[PDB]
Amino acid sequence: MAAPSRIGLALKKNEQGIADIYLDASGNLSMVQNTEAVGQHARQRLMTYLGEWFLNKNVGVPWLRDLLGKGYDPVLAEAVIKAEILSTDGVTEITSFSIRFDQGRRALEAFDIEVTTEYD
């Protein structure tokens, strides 16, 4: 029972670092495929705030409710980010995950995240 093929609109970051739809060298609207599609979908899932969508207030991450605030907490942030990534369709496992906090920038940094999809 192989993994079904997936497809979605490609998003590339522009000169300001904001993700926007793109035209490849051919000039036709670029579409992402099986595994890069799931990766970009996981990004759009991570970037959405809970209760933001007017048709469904249950999608999004509770960035503002849980993490963004006065409470640096690695276990909670790790749990929330893993939940969001693992709930993405096509993702099977997260093999690695590292997290740290720069007090000067007040920057919470999650890196070394390796995601394995059903396409292996």
């Binding site: 933001e52 048709l55 469904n56 409470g71 907490d73 690695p74």
Partner: protein, 182 residues
């Protein structure tokens, strides 16, 4: 490694959480012999159970707040030190005053996860199903984000036969003349 939470059930704050108890049940079913062969649809995940042991400085005020919150019967997100839990309802609150602890609140709170997303006899079916994971879920009043959007998205409520209320005779005559007399 624990979540490092704010130590409260729902809104009402507590001074101390003395102990957590977490339970997750999966019910298997078996007939007298082993019946299998491409069938594992027979296993059910029960709603999770939590048993906190708590204490508070303001005994009477905290007891009243806990009882009122319990009686509202409103599901809530319980923050524990081992996991986050959505849709928890308090099923039991127990408190003991004795020689050892007489002027504080000390007791047990039991919570259970709530099951849901099925009423039907007042809901209908017109289009999509909702089980497709590459599509958005069906818009409904429950999951709309604004009052206007809920008005737009309401699937409509449909309960059975109504009985209208009869009107007093003179009021009825006045109203019927008011409309149907000119």
């Amino acid at each position: 490694m624990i979540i490092a939470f704010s130590s409260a059930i729902g809104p009402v704050p507590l001074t101390v959480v003395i102990s957590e108890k977490h339970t997750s049940k999966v019910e298997l079913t078996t007939n007298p012999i082993e019946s299998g062969a491409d069938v594992t649809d027979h296993a059910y995940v029960k709603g999770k159970e939590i048993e906190l042991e708590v204490a508070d400085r303001n005994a009477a005020a905290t007891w009243a707040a806990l009882v009122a919150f319990q009686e509202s019967r409103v599901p809530f997100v319980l923050m524990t030190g081992l996991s986050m839990y959505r849709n928890m309802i308090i099923t039991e609150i127990d408190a003991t005053r004795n020689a050892q602890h007489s002027k504080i609140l000390k007791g047990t709170v039991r919570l259970r996860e709530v099951k849901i997303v099925e009423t039907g006899t007042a809901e209908d079916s017109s289009g999509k199903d909702g089980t497709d994971k590459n599509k958005s879920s069906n818009p409904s009043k429950d999951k709309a984000a604004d009052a206007k959007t809920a008005d737009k998205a309401n699937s409509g409520v449909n309960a059975g036969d109504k009985g209208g209320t009869t009107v007093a005779a003179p009021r009825a005559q006045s109203l019927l003349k008011g409309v149907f007399g000119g």
